[PDB]
Structure 1
Amino acid sequence: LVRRSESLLAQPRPDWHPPWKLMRVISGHLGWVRALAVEPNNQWFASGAGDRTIKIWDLASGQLRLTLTGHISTVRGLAVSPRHPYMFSCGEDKMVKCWDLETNKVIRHYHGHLSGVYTLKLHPTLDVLVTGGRDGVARVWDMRTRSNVHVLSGHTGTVADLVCQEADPQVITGSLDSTVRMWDLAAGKTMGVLTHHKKGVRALVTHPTEFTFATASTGSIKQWKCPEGAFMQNFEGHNAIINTLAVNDQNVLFSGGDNGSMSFWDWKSGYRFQSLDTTAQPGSLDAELGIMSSTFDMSGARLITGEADKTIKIWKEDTTATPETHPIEWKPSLVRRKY
C-alpha cells in the first residue's frame, strides 16, 4: 500500500475570503456571451457573443463603447495584447483575426484551422498566439508573419482550452477527449499527458504567483503542479459541466457551471467558501441558465461573467462581510478519501 502523510499539515486551513454578490447585468448582446478580455490597463473589457459581434465595454460604467463586426460565426476567443495595440479574436467560422486597436479594423488573418476555433492565448513574453479547435489541433502562430509555426497534435477530441505561460510547460491544452496535454513550445512535442479526468476537459487556468495550474471537467476540478504535472488536489462539490475557472491574485478559484451554477473556492486549501446559482435575464428559459465565459479584471476585485441568457454579470466581493459574519465551516476530517 502507498503510504499517506499523517502529519495533519497536508490539509492547509483555508484563508477567509468575503462572499461575492451581483453588481451588474449588461444587455445588448443577441447571442450567448462566450468571450471576455480585459485590457492590460483595466479600463475596458471585450465580450464576444453568438451574434458574431465583439463589444467593447467600459469597465467602470458598464457602458457600451463600441461594436465590431467581421466574424460570421460565434466569437469564442479574444485577447488584448499587453505589448501591442492588438486584439485577437477567434470564431466558429475557422477565422483567427488580429484587430488593430488604433484603427478598429482587422489587419491580420491566421488561417489554417479546419473547423471552428474555441481558444486563443497570447504568450506572455513571446510574440506568439495559440488557438485550438474542433480539429484536435493546437495551432501555434507567429504574430508578425501569420505563419503556423507549430501544429500540436495528439488530442483525439476538440481542444477546448489552453494556457500560455513563460516557463515549460509553455502550452497546456485540455480537450474533450478527457485528456490534458503539456507541451514544450520550442519543439512542438508533448511533455506530458494527464488522464485523470473522466469527461471532456473544458476549463483551464494558471495561478498568477504560484507555478501551478488547474483543469476542470464536469463534477471535478483538479489542481496540478508544474513542470512535472503532479496532482496537487481536488476541488469537489460542483456537480455540473464546468465551463470556466478564475483564480485571483488573492487566491480565488471561480468555477461556472453550465446549468447556471457558481462555486468560489480558496485556492490553497480547496475549500469552497461560496456556492451560488445565477439568475436569468427576464424572458429567458430555465435551460438558458448558464455561465459560459468568465474572467477577472486586472485588479481582481470584479468578476465578469458572460452568460447564456446573453448577459454580462459583474460580481463584487462583499465589503460588509467579516470572518464572524461568514465563518469558515471547514474541519480537518479524518477520512480515507478513496482515490
Structure 2
Amino acid sequence: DYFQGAMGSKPAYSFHVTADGQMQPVPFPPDALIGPGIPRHARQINTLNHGEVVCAVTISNPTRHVYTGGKGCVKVWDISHPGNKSPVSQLDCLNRDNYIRSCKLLPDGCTLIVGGEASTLSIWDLAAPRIKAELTSSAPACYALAISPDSKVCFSCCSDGNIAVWDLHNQTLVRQFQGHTDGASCIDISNDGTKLWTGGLDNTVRSWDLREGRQLQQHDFTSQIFSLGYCPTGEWLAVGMESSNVEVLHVNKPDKYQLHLHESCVLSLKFAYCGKWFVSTGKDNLLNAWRTPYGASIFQSKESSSVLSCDISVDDKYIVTGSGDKKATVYEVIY
C-alpha cells in the first residue's frame, strides 16, 4: 500500500538461445513480473558501516544478525536493533591486510566458516563467538565456500583452481576436485545434493559428482565466471560473467537464457529460496532482481558503488549486499 507498482520498459534484454546459434527475445508469461512469491519492490532499511570493502555477506537464521567480511575481519551486526550503528562482535580471521572472500553459516546457525586471501579457513563457534578450529590448506587463498546439506563437509574454491573437500569433524582434507586451470571463483550444490557446480577464472563452469568425485560436465565461455547459483527447485543454473552477461543454463539440456542488464562484471548472484527469482550484483553499482528462469526484470536498485557480494534470508524477506563503498546494505523485500 505504501508503494504501488508502475510498469516500465526497456529495449529487449532477455533472450532465449536455442541449441544452434540463434538468439530470440523472450515473450514474458503473465506471471513474469507479478504473482505469488514475486517481489513488488525492495526497500533499503539499514546501512552497516564496515569501513572496508565488503567482499562477503551472510545473514543469520532467524534473521537478526548480519555478518560482513572486510579486510582481516568479519563484523557482526544486530539488525533487530535499528538504533545500532556499530557491530556487536568482531571476528579477527586473517591478516589485517588480507580480504575475507567468503563466510558461511552452518544449517543450524551455531557455526561460521570464514575463508579469504589466506591459506587458512577459520571455524567459529557462535554459541553463548570464539575460534573453534582452523583448516590449513596448501592453496594460497580461498575465493568461495559451500557447506554440504548434512553440514558434515565444507567445499572450498582455491585460488589454484582446485576444489577442496573438508571433513569438518576431524579437520581433514578428504578429497580434492582438480580441473579448473585458474582460480575457482564460485560454487553451489544441486538441489538433490548429489552434484557440485563450480565456476572459474579459466572461463569454465564445471559440474562434479559428489558420490564419485569426478567431473561430469564442462561449459566453456568467452569470459571469466565470477558467480553462479543453482535454482532450489532445480533445472536451472545462473552464471554471472565478467562480460556483464548473466547466463541461465538449462541443466543437462542445450537451451539457455542470456540476460543483459549489467554494464560491467557480474560479481555475485543468489537465488531466492523459493527459486522463483534471483538477484545479481555488478561492478556497475546495480542490484538486479530477475524472474526464474527467463530473467524478466522484477526490480533494480542502483547503489553508490560496486556491489561485490550478496545474500538472501531463508524466508526470502531480506537481501544484504556488500559494497565497494566500504559498507553493506540491508533491504526488506516487499511482496
Q: Verify same fold: TM over 0.5.
A: yes
Aligned pair partner of 1:307 in 323, 330, 335? 323
Q: Which amino acid aligns with 2:143?
A: Y
1:84–1:252: structure 2 CA closer, same or farther, 3 Å change rule?
A: closer
Aligned pair partner of 1:74 in 79, 83, 99? 99
Structural mapping, 1:216-295, within 5 Å: 216-217=240-241, 218-226=243-251, 228=252, 230-248=254-272, 249=274, 251-279=276-304, 289-295=305-311
Aligned to 1:18: 40
2:119 equivalent to 1:94? yes
2:212 equivalent to 1:187? yes
Structural mapping, 1:112-261, within 5 Å: 112-165=137-190, 167=192, 170-195=195-220, 197-217=221-241, 218-226=243-251, 228=252, 230-248=254-272, 249=274, 251-261=276-286
How far off its partner does 1:9 sit?
Answer: 9.8
Deviates more, 1:185-194 or 1:15-24: 15-24
CA distance in 1, matches of 2:191, 2:334: 34
CA distance in 1, matches of 2:81, 2:146: 27
Whether the aligned pair in 1 keeps the contact of 2:194 and 2:211 (CA below 8 Å) is no
CA distance in 2, matches of 1:145, 1:3: 49
For structure 2, list consecutive stretches of 5 or more residues without a partner in the other structure.
1-17
Q: Which amino acid aligns with 1:26?
A: L
1:90–1:4: structure 2 CA closer, same or farther, 3 Å change rule?
A: closer
Q: Which amino acid aligns with 1:39?
A: S
More strand by share: 2
CA distance in 2, matches of 1:309, 1:120: 24
How far off its partner does 1:117 sit?
Answer: 0.8
Aligned length: 304
Aligned to 1:316: 332
Whether the aligned pair in 1 keeps the contact of 2:190 and 2:234 (CA below 8 Å) is no
Aligned pair partner of 1:53 in 30, 54, 73? 73
Q: Which amino acid aligns with 2:75?
A: K
Whether the aligned pair in 1 keeps the contact of 2:265 and 2:282 (CA below 8 Å) is yes
SS of the aligned residue for 1:135 comes to coil
**Residues 93-134 of structure 1, C-alpha deviation per residue, up to 9 Å, x if partnerless?**
121111122262212221124211111110112511000121
CA distance in 1, matches of 2:114, 2:20: 48
- Percent identity reads 18
SS of the aligned residue for 2:136 comes to coil
**Residues 59-112 of structure 1, C-alpha deviation per residue, up to 9 Å, x if partnerless?**
333532211113212111111111462110002012111112226221222112
Whether the aligned pair in 2 keeps the contact of 1:123 and 1:165 (CA below 8 Å) is no
Q: Which amino acid aligns with 1:201?
A: I
How far off its partner does 1:145 sit?
Answer: 1.3
Q: Which amino acid aligns with 1:212?
A: W
CA distance in 2, matches of 1:274, 1:299: 18
CA distance in 1, matches of 2:103, 2:59: 9
Whether the aligned pair in 1 keeps the contact of 2:232 and 2:275 (CA below 8 Å) is no
1:102–1:22: structure 2 CA closer, same or farther, 3 Å change rule?
A: closer
Q: Which amino acid aligns with 1:24?
A: N
Aligned to 1:37: 58
SS of the aligned residue for 2:104 comes to coil
CA distance in 2, matches of 1:91, 1:3: 40
How far off its partner does 1:20 sit?
Answer: 2.5
Whether the aligned pair in 1 keeps the contact of 2:316 and 2:333 (CA below 8 Å) is no
**Residues 243-294 of structure 1, C-alpha deviation per residue, up to 9 Å, x if partnerless?**
1112222622211111312322112332123333212xxxxxxxxx200111
Whether the aligned pair in 2 keeps the contact of 1:92 and 1:117 (CA below 8 Å) is yes
Q: TM-score, normalised by structure 2?
A: 0.83
SS of the aligned residue for 1:155 comes to coil
Whether the aligned pair in 2 keeps the contact of 1:170 and 1:185 (CA below 8 Å) is yes
Q: Indicate the structure whose relative CO is greater, using CA pairs within 8 Å and at least 6 residues apart.
A: 2
